[PDB]
Amino acid sequence: QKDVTIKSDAPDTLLLEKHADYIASYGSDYEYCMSEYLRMSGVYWGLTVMDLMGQLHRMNKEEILVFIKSCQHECGGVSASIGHDPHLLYTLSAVQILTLYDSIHVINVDKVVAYVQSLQKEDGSFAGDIWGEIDTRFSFCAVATLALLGKLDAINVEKAIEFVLSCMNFDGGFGCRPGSESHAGQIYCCTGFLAITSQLHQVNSDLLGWWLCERQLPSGGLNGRPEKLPDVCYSWWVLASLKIIGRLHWIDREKLRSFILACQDEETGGFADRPGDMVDPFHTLFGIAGLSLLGEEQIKPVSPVFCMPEEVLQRVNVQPELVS
Amino acid sequence: AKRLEREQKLKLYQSATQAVFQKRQAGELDESVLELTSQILGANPDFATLWNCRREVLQHLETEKSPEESAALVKAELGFLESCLRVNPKSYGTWHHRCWLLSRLPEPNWARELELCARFLEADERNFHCWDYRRFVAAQAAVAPAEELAFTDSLITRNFSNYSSWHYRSCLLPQLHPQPRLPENVLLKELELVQNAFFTDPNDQSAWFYHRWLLGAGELSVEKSTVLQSELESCKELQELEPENKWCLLTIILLMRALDPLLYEKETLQYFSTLKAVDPMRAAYLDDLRSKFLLENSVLKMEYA
Ligand SMILES: COc1ccc(S(=O)(=O)N2Cc3cc(C#N)ccc3N(Cc3cncn3C)C[C@H]2Cc2ccccc2)cc1
Ligand SMILES: [Ca+2]
Ligand SMILES: [Zn+2]
């Protein structure tokens, strides 16, 4: 029932030049300053979407490398911004960026590994930082960071696996913690985790795949759980999970594609969560990355596990086997 | 006025953030930082480093204060967190700070925390942050699955935003009957409860998802056979009343599977055709499900002596 209706004059063409201009100019401001707490991930979203569009060169590599170095703390962890506190979220984003730039040794990789290792608990879970918030999101951040550094062996993988599987639910999905309700963002993290750790055979792919394709609403857009509005970023969280478990064909590609295109702002460039809303870099990445998963010609193939260009992952030999 | 004023918001937030970080480098872990961060965390609860600052302040103050002075700070923190949650009830930072706080208290009032959860779930029965917090509280207070099961019933019958309540039941039911796959009597009662739900509101997708789980969660007895047959006929009745309802069509297929895959092969295949027409977006899924069922049927046919 809850859905949007796509108005007749919504964009129906891909405006790649506009999106690249939008990201290229982003952070030249209320929103910007108020989101300093996520800056490193913001940088990751911008750089990755630019690289997918073939426009990475328009961003400032040297400036970003210096920024990343200054955000690594003595513990090895990386913060969102200078003077903010280290967290697994921004550690992953930083490592993702350096991978895009083939500049991993700009930071101390041994200390990053030590940092990740230190956040694992007895039950196999990971805290986000020293303050102990437990979320399967952080299991994904840990293994994805380590995979990109060639150091997955640094954590207790079997225990990590056991914890993630303990968060599997009646509907085939996954929650933040044991007994937590399924939702698409979480499912992406856990299926991504299971891809990296070679445990996709433990997913009920038919059941989960069904729950995921039922995210598609009559508008063609995807929500993140039953009875919620669609949002363009689910073109990532849902589609990536479906791809990982070999069930991407279970959604209607053409109707989703039309929904994603309708979320573009033809004036400013960028994508918004839903058509006519204000764009942001987060939704711009996931709009573009979703289109790439659907096989969009003008966009580089993207890893459904890492949400980075596949050519980057090919280069570092980190390409987890999927279900198909 | 509107756009002009948020310049003033920024520069205050900016100045306050400046002061907090300067104070923090200086080792000034005092109440002024609590005051500065209260002004920022209200509008910006996802600014994680400020929650860390508050914790560092509270930890430090605990060392150089009397028990009753520390108790006052805790109660002020609880009020601050409640006010923050009213403004943004879905911020991870806010819920975690509350968890951190309650986990270190000598005598927490868990019954009060459960009531806070009841209230927030009245406003938004799908708020998973709150449900997760409730489970945490329920664990600490050692509240029994049976007591939480009663809670889910009231929520399910009183109104319909029910996916989160059904999910909770799915985790509680196994705890009441913990094997190292529900007992049939329990399953039968759940089937009756969920059937009531999706006939009351046939558009309620949560009941249909939960019902699919029950159809897997437990060779048919005469009673289960009879119950399942009864569900089948009831879904056909609903199909007449709501012919565009895809959930009832899929459930008819699943029921036949649960009953006798080969005996109902003809009807199963007819229902697939109808269902794809009613739910064309799921056509590829429905073909793969049908292919799977046909393969199962072939295997069942080949088991024939
Ligand atoms: C717009 O007010 C907000 C609200 C929250 C946040 S957030 O907590 O930092 N974070 C990142 C995020 C970044 C941007 C951008 N630029 C926009 C949104 C958004 N959301 C919120 C959102 C997205 N879809 C719908 N919703 C409601 C996700 C959230 C959590 C998240 C972080 C990293 C990876 C995945 C998920 C930021 C801004
Ligand atoms: Ca450049
Ligand atoms: Zn979104």
UniProtKB/Swiss-Prot annotation, chain A:
Its EC number is 2.5.1.60. CDD domains: GGTase-II. Disulfide bonds: none annotated. The keyword RNA-binding does not apply. Keywords: Acetylation, Metal-binding, Phosphoprotein, Prenyltransferase, Repeat, Transferase, Zinc. Geranylgeranyl diphosphate binds at H183, A184, G185, Y234, S235, W236, W237. Zn(2+) binds at D231, C233, H283. Binds 1 zinc ion per subunit. Pfam families: Prenyltrans. GO terms for molecular function: isoprenoid binding; Rab geranylgeranyltransferase activity; small GTPase binding; zinc ion binding. InterPro entries: PGGT1B-like, Prenyltrans, Ptb1, Terpenoid_cyclase/PrenylTrfase. Its cofactor is Zn(2+). Gene3D superfamilies: 1.50.10.20. One of its GO terms (biological process) is protein geranylgeranylation. The enzymatic reaction requires the aid of a Rab escort protein (also called component A), such as CHM. Most abundant in the heart, brain, spleen and liver. Less in the lung, muscle, kidney and testis; in these tissues, more abundant than the subunit alpha. Catalyzes the transfer of a geranylgeranyl moiety from geranylgeranyl diphosphate to both cysteines of Rab proteins with the C-terminal sequence -XXCC, -XCXC and -CCXX, such as RAB1A, RAB3A, RAB5A and RAB7A. Heterotrimer composed of RABGGTA, RABGGTB and CHM; within this trimer, RABGGTA and RABGGTB form the catalytic component B, while CHM (component A) mediates peptide substrate binding. The Rab GGTase dimer (RGGT) interacts with CHM (component A) prior to Rab protein binding; the association is stabilized by geranylgeranyl pyrophosphate (GGpp). The CHM:RGGT:Rab complex is destabilized by GGpp. Interaction of RABGGTB with prenylated PTP4A2 precludes its association with RABGGTA and inhibits enzyme activity. Interacts with CHODL. Belongs to the protein prenyltransferase subunit beta family. PANTHER family: GERANYLGERANYL TRANSFERASE TYPE BETA SUBUNIT, GERANYLGERANYL TRANSFERASE TYPE-2 SUBUNIT BETA. This is Geranylgeranyl transferase type-2 subunit beta. It comes from Rattus norvegicus (Rat). The gene is Rabggtb.
From Swiss-Prot, chain B:
GO terms for molecular function: Rab geranylgeranyltransferase activity; small GTPase binding; zinc ion binding. PFTA repeats lie at residues 29-63, 73-107, 109-143, 144-178, 186-216, 227-261. The enzymatic reaction requires the aid of a Rab escort protein (also called component A), such as CHM. Keywords: Leucine-rich repeat, Phosphoprotein, Prenyltransferase, Repeat, Transferase. It catalyses: geranylgeranyl diphosphate + L-cysteinyl-[protein] = S-geranylgeranyl-L-cysteinyl-[protein] + diphosphate. Its EC number is 2.5.1.60. GO terms for cellular component: cytoplasm; Rab-protein geranylgeranyltransferase complex. Catalyzes the transfer of a geranylgeranyl moiety from geranylgeranyl diphosphate to both cysteines of Rab proteins with the C-terminal sequence -XXCC, -XCXC and -CCXX, such as RAB1A, RAB3A, RAB5A and RAB7A. This is Geranylgeranyl transferase type-2 subunit alpha. It comes from Rattus norvegicus. The lineage of its organism: Eukaryota, Metazoa, Chordata, Craniata, Vertebrata. The chain holds residues 16 to 441 of 567 of the full protein.
